[PDB]
Write a protein that binds this ligand. Structure first.
Ligand SMILES: CO[C@H]1O[C@H](CO)[C@@H](O[C@H]2O[C@H](CO)[C@@H](O)[C@H](O)[C@@H]2O)[C@H](O)[C@@H]1O
Ligand SMILES: CO[C@H]1O[C@H](CO)[C@@H](O[C@H]2O[C@H](CO)[C@@H](O)[C@H](O)[C@@H]2O)[C@H](O)[C@@H]1O
Ligand SMILES: [Ca+2]
Ligand SMILES: [Ca+2]
Ligand SMILES: [Mn+2]
Ligand SMILES: [Mn+2]
Lengths: 241, 241
């Protein structure tokens, strides 16, 4: 299809079009990306991701078209600790993507240790909401919580300082304009606090024509729940000249 | 997802989200449901169907909601014979639906011979464009080409007279309103000729909560091509009160 869209206002337990990887699962009409105990408390050493089953036609060589897409979603993080880790990320990657070996903790379940910073060894674009930046383990991170755009590397090509609020839902809008090649991110808390970050990227030189979209989250030594509450997505192939 | 939609203005050969069954395949940016030779000419004894891979949430018991959906599509039929057969149908059925054994010819690849007219043995709703009605073989058909609404049986719950035009595209709009429970069908040729037919049906007593949508076509002794040229679909769960 040239166009595709879907919307999950909530996440009822009987899902049919979601690919669950790692510890991801549905609980209380929301997606708990990371593992929790019987009491609903976050645990350490856990990774989880979800992908929509239908593949997205991001670009088409024969027609020289590139898709214009928008992803809207909300999530919340909760943790008895004040150093919650490690973060949640919206990502786009080849359809057969799986959790790389040893991609836990600060690698957010998206990159392999040995090539986490090798841009020519990866095929992924992601928008991370990173809450852990200890310079000893996350050497690639700026020294403060942040939202970043990742293009084939765990070291963001661009970031903006961000504030983690325990238990509060963050509303996010991610848009890609093929005409300008700008990937824009806008995140806001219910009180109006707003954060923005953008970057110009030619998706054609990074990802294949067909991809899958989803979310990933992970907790290493430090932990917190990564609860995905809602999500809607839409993409349309457009002639851009 | 509570809502889902997709659009195929045309059908390029590299598809990822279509399930092809039988002889269906892509040729010249269109879906040829029935088999054709090297010259693109129709042949006898062929059946083929396609289904969109993502499952559609038709209704939800827990929330008492039922989907509002619309399917717009166009096709063309072509044959050197004076009596091209057998027809093409848009249908909705359980996710695991496959071509029934011996469902060729007048059964349109939708029903098995032994239970073709047993409404309690089937789970399918289809809109057929039936071009073959010989009273000696298709005993269940009215005596003329027609558009029919099928509910668990090859013997339409309703039919209206229709004209077959060789090589001319027919545009069709199929909609379902959960509020009135009306399944409406509107078909037109490029010169303005119009056909309409509707039927009241509670989809909840006929189909499971999750289903797949697609098209089916077949040719028995007589033949013709069944070319699907375009298709767009959309559905959204709504509270029915
Ligand atoms: C000195 O490193 C120790 O402590 C690190 C952080 O406490 C730890 O890193 C793990 O946990 C963090 C936070 O969850 C995560 O970002 C890392 O990727 C890693 O999983 C080290 O392993 C040591 O214990
Ligand atoms: C009396 O029946 C004979 O002729 C029928 C029509 O030619 C034929 O039926 C087959 O073909 C029709 C048309 O394609 C189709 O509707 C039937 O389902 C069947 O496949 C009979 O087989 C006999 O030859
Ligand atoms: Ca980090
Ligand atoms: Ca018939
Ligand atoms: Mn980071
Ligand atoms: Mn009929």
């Amino acid at each position: 299809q040239d166009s595709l869209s879907f919307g999950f206002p909530t996440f009822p337990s009987d899902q049919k079009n979601l690919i669950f990887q790692g510890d991801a699962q549905i609980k209380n009409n929301a997606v708990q990306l990371t593992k929790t105990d019987s009491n609903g408390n976050p645990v350490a050493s856990t990774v989880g991701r979800i992908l929509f089953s239908a593949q997205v036609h991001l670009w088409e060589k024969s027609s020289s078209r590139v898709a214009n897409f928008q992803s809207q979603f909300s999530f919340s993080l909760k943790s008895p600790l004040s150093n919650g880790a490690d973060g949640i990320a919206f990502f786009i990657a080849p359809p057969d993507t799986t959790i790389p070996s040893g991609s836990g903790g600060g690698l957010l379940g998206l990159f392999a240790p040995g090539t986490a910073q090798n841009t020519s060894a990866n095929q992924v674009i992601a928008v991370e909401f990173d809450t852990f930046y200890a310079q000893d383990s996350n050497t690639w991170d700026p020294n403060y919580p942040h939202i970043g755009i990742d293009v084939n590397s765990i070291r963001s090509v661009k970031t903006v300082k961000w504030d983690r609020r325990d238990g509060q839902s963050l509303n996010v809008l991610v848009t890609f304009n093929p005409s300008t090649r700008n990937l824009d991110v806008v995140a806001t808390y219910s009180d109006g606090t707003r954060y923005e970050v953008s970057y110009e990227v030619d998706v054609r030189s990074v990802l294949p024509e067909w991809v899958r979209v989803g979310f990933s989250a992970a907790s290493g030594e430090q932990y917190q729940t990564h609860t995905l509450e809602s999500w809607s997505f839409t993409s349309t192939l457009l002639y851009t000249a």
